[PDB]
Amino acid sequence: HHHHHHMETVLRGASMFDEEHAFTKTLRKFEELVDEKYDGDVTFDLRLNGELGVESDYVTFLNQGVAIDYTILAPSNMAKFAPSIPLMDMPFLFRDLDHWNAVLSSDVLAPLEDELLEKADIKIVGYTGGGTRNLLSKQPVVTFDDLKGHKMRVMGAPIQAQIFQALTAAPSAIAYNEVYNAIQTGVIAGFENEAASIQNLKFYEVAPNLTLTRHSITVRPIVMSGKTFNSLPADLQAVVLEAGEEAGAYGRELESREDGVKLQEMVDAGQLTVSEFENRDKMLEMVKPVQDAYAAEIGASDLLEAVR
């Protein structure tokens, strides 16, 4: 029972997925690297398979500085606590993987890290991600006529609903752990997600039709509560940042390399039908005003212009 006050230091982690998903692998890598680097003793207890909830639960736990110490979070699942952070990977921000890489390789997102720590008391310790989010639906959704009034789940950050509303869909902010049933019972027609999570959680079972809208390339901060991070001894803080950086690099090389491979696995297995979206590039035009407006609202117009 008895731990070190800031025998061992115990850091609790959470993942929504099993051991086969890139996020869980990234968190394992993080734990491995802290152990390698820290001339000291630390114990990690990673709770998998969504045993501790989903990201909307995790972010409140980290803000409170209890329950869990570290995890990975989507920017658009953190909007309640830091309204600017969804800019980090909002839909249609990145042109392609090269663009996305040029961002994560810089320190250009620093202002958003700073806001998250100041407003939400959550410390970014590295970046994973690299999945490409596409529409996944019960029936094919392949034209703007199909998309008009298309009922779909979005994450809760305002920008997600605003983007898909601009594309003429009917977005709904439904909990991630309720999506499968909401589709299966016809409440919504689909959602949007990247290959690795679709495969790992078997969302193809209810939504077999994937449309290549390629509307987000994920940026997924590895996060520790500010309360825990700031409590750690100074040498361990520095190790956590180095470990986090390297683990993020590992995770995003991994997920980005596997994304197309996993789409093909699901096609080959007869689990997904993959379709292009007709006149997809018209989406870029339609989405600009919403993007510009959001950046202006949060006072990040200069930061957005840079990224583009």
Ligand X SMILES: O=C(O)[C@H]1O[C@H](O)[C@@H](O)[C@@H](O)[C@H]1O
Annotated binding-site residue? 153: yes
Cβ nearer to ligand X, comparing 69 with 239: 69
Q: Is 144 helix (H, G, I), strand (E, B) or coil?
A: helix
Minimum separation from the CB atom of position 41 to ligand X (A): 31
Annotated binding-site residue? 253: no
Our finding on whether 220 is near ligand X (CB under 6 A) is yes
Residues 141, 274: Cα–Cα separation, whole Å: 10
Q: Which of residues 76-135 bind ligand X (CB under 6 A)?
A: 77
Q: Which amino acid is at 102?
A: A
Annotated binding-site residue? 55: yes
Residue with tokens 């994920």: 218
Strand partners, 135: 192, 211
Dihedral pair phi/psi, residue 238, rounded to 5°: -65, -40
Sketch the per residue contact string, 222 through 251, with ligand X: x for CB under 6 A, - otherwise.
------------------------------
Residues 6+ apart with CB under 8 A from 26: 72, 128, 222, 247, 248, 250, 251, 254
Binding residue (CB under 6 A) for ligand X from 197, 211, 213, 256: 197
> Where does 164-286 show beta strands of DSSP type E?
170-172, 190-193, 209-225, 273-275
| Cβ atoms of residues 111 and 120 within 8 Å | no
Our finding on whether 137 is near ligand X (CB under 6 A) is no
Q: Is 71 helix (H, G, I), strand (E, B) or coil?
A: strand
Cβ nearer to ligand X, comparing 14 with 290: 14
Judging by beta carbons within 10 Å of its beta carbon (0-12, 13-18, 19+), is residue 77 exposed, middle or buried?
A: buried
**Which span sits near ligand X by CB under 6 A: 97-105, 116-124, 162-170, 193-201?**
193-201
Cβ nearer to ligand X, comparing 9 with 131: 131
Q: Which of residues 140-179 bind ligand X (CB under 6 A)?
A: 155, 176
Annotated binding-site residue? 308: no
Annotated binding-site residue? 47: no
Binding residue (CB under 6 A) for ligand X from 24, 25, 48, 55: 55
| Cβ atoms of residues 247 and 221 within 8 Å | no
Annotated binding-site residue? 133: yes
> Of 142, 154, 199, 159, which Cα lies nearest the Cα of 178?
154
Residues 6+ apart with CB under 8 A from 69: 11, 12, 13, 62, 224, 225, 228
Our finding on whether 218 is near ligand X (CB under 6 A) is yes
Annotated binding-site residue? 77: yes
Binding residue (CB under 6 A) for ligand X from 14, 27, 33, 74: 74
Minimum separation from the CB atom of position 6 to ligand X (A): 29
**Which span sits near ligand X by CB under 6 A: 5-13, 101-109, 192-200, 230-238?**
192-200
Residues 169, 152: Cα–Cα separation, whole Å: 7
State which H helix or E strand residue 31 sits in.
Answer: helix 22-37
Cβ nearer to ligand X, comparing 88 with 236: 88
Binding residue (CB under 6 A) for ligand X from 193, 199, 211, 228: 193
DSSP 276: P
List, as residue ranges, the binding site.
55, 77, 133, 153, 176, 193-194, 220
Contacting residues toward ligand X, per CB under 6 A: 55, 74, 77, 155, 176, 193-194, 197, 218, 220
